[PDB]
A paper describes a structure:
Here we show that [name] has a tripartite haemolytic α-PFT (SmhABC), and propose a mechanism of pore assembly. We present the structures of the soluble A component ([name]), as well as the soluble and pore conformations of the B component (SmhB).
[name] folds into two distinct domains, a compact five helical bundle (α1, α2, α3, α6 and α7), and an associated head domain containing two helices (α4 and α5), and the β-tongue domain (two long anti-parallel β-strands, β1 and β2). In all monomers, there is missing density for approximately 20 residues between β1 and β2 (G208 – A229). Residues E192-V205 (β1 and loop to α3) and Y231-N250 (β2 and loop to α4) of the β-tongue domain are largely hydrophobic containing only polar uncharged and nonpolar residues, and are buried in the core of the protein, packing against α1, α3, α4, α5 (residues A272-Q283), and residues N351-E367 at the C-terminus. This would result in the pore form of [name] having a similar extended helical structure to that of AhlB and SmhB.
Author numbering: 3 to 209, 226 to 367
């Protein structure tokens, strides 16, 4: 009986919001990697200088790819959801009970949307397979650069290892702060996201070439109106300490200080890329659930041949339409955010 058909978006609304959350942030981490000053100096360890410049270059290539290609691929999948909402409205409009065969024509269209949902499932799979491929190339790229930093650190005296750990610990703290700020800006999908950037630290380089390597860091847009004031205060305090800690490690190991600064930025990008891939892994299945739900619903909608059965079906469809319209708005805002969040503006005090 009709009482059992589910023409709803299921967990698509929430599933798209959990994707937006990481993809939008990863958009900002891509902008950070592309804004960061390159290492120019050729007056330091020739062997390690080439490993940093090579890694920094390989990261900007992947940041550009994510920013220009992968974001567009996602906006494509979101549009497909709007499109589906629009089609459900049409089914609603068809139930103006003017038509003497209204239930056979209704069944036919629900059966057709089952097909569309199956295409949107396959479209999502295609995007996930590309994200999975990049993940499998990014993990070993970062993994290899970590083994390079580690080999260098394993040969330092105790004073330098402590200066290096202080830095590693602060980068880990700063990442938790940024995440807290981004969550507050995002407002669980209903927010209009913006993150900024500024120079936060510097690495003096032994004695003009590149007097100093300038370190770019994410910043909140409003140092007193973001709805995560404690995180903004911790971020300010942590950047202050980060500046001091690089000045310390730099006295003796300047080039390692640089390598660490780059790896901290890579970590944010690769970690949230992995989370983007993982949230996207569930999307094809969720479209497939809409496909199965719509396939099962159609023959049941066809059995409705009475006055009260057609009235009940109009009601079941009108309700599920409202659900898709609400979802369509969540999508409109996500697309506006992917457009607006394409730039990571400078912030000044």
């Amino acid at each position: 009986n009709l009482t059992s058909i589910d023409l709803s978006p299921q967990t698509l609304m929430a599933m798209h919001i959990s994707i937006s959350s990481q993809a939008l942030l990863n958009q900002s981490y891509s902008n950070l990697l592309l804004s960061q000053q390159l290492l120019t100096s050729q007056s330091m360890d020739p062997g390690l200088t080439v490993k940093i410049k090579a890694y920094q270059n390989q990261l900007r290539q992947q940041a550009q790819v994510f920013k220009q290609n992968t974001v567009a691929e996602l906006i494509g999948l979101y549009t497909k959801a709007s499109n589906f909402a629009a089609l459900v409205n049409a089914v609603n409009a068809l139930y103006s009970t003017e038509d003497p065969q209204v239930s056979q024509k209704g069944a036919e269209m629900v059966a057709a949307l089952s097909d569309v949902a199956q295409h949107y499932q396959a479209a999502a799979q295609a995007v996930h397979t590309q994200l999975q491929a990049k993940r499998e190339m990014l993990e070993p790229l970062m993994g290899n650069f970590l083994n390079v930093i580690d080999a260098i650190e394993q040969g330092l005296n105790a004073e330098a290892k402590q200066q290096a750990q202080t830095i590693a610990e602060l980068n880990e703290a700063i990442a938790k702060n940024i995440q807290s700020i981004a969550d507050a800006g995002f407002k669980a999908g209903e927010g209009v996201v913006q993150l900024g950037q500024s120079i936060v630290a510097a690495v003096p380089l032994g004695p003009s070439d590149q007097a100093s390597y300038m370190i770019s860091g994410i910043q909140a847009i409003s140092a007193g109106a973001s709805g995560a004031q404690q995180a903004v205060n911790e971020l300010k305090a942590n950047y202050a300490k980060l500046a001091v800690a690089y000045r310390a490690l730099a006295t003796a190991n300047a080039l390692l200080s640089v390598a660490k600064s780059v790896q901290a930025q890579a970590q944010l990008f690769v970690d949230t890329y992995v989370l983007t891939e993982q949230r996207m892994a569930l999307l094809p299945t969720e479209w497939g659930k809409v496909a199965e739900a719509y396939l099962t619903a159609a023959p049941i909608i066809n059995q409705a041949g009475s006055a009260a059965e057609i009235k009940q079906a109009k009601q079941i469809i009108s309700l599920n339409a409202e659900k898709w319209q609400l979802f369509s708005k969540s999508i409109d805002n996500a697309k506006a955010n992917y457009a607006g969040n394409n730039i990571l503006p400078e912030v000044l005090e």
